[PDB]
Amino acid sequence: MPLPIPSLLIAGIGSRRGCSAEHLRALLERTLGEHGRSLAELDALASIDGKRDEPGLRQLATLLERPVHFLAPAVLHDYEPRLLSPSAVALRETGCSSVAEAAALALAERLGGGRADLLGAKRSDDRASIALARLLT
Template sequence: MILAAGLGCQRNCDVHTLLTLLDGALAEAGIERQRLSALASIDRKREEPGLIALAHLLQLPLLCFSAAQLASYEDRLSHKSAAAFAHTGCHGIAESAALALVEQLAGAPARLLISRRKNAKATFALACAG
């Protein structure tokens, strides 16, 4: 099963903040970190040090999508953020990035397995195919 973690974060969010959010959400759902296939975010976060460090730490690829690609998932989001839209042009980074990546990797419809979770600096969601 393909599991993709979608992540959004504030500028210069550190890897430990991201990892704590990811691990907490996975633990709550009873999913082992090793089951993750890849990480996803918006293209403007492609060079974000915390996301790059997280991908390296987890030994997973980080794939990024444009705001236009992510906006096509708007009707499937559990939460629509006006702040995210104002900054990026899409209403939710974590959920839409996770859905987009699963659909790209699986070539099949994706669904949210873990809807948006957040802390003060980041958001996380998990999607799977089927």
């Protein structure tokens, strides 16, 4: 009996200082809606670990009752070659050319144990970026 899928869906988030839970949640909702996915289907949120706290992301994780994992800059860098939206601010600050895309892939593959795929390029506004990754199966 092959169980194909714990089908896994992860949202990677990169955000500017101060970005609210409500802002993030609205961007997240629109991003999921583009791909015909619902908040209810997310398994976890991912972002980059650093010193700065982001109360907005922790609050969003509490709203969703789902975890947020913060991943080492070094782990995210491993995903540079597979990113869809190679960036500046990001690359400058974090060494990583898209925090949202890298963190979504990196977490999906870590929780899921095989190859992950982005659903599309990240969606960004002035304050935050969201990317979605799933298990290649």
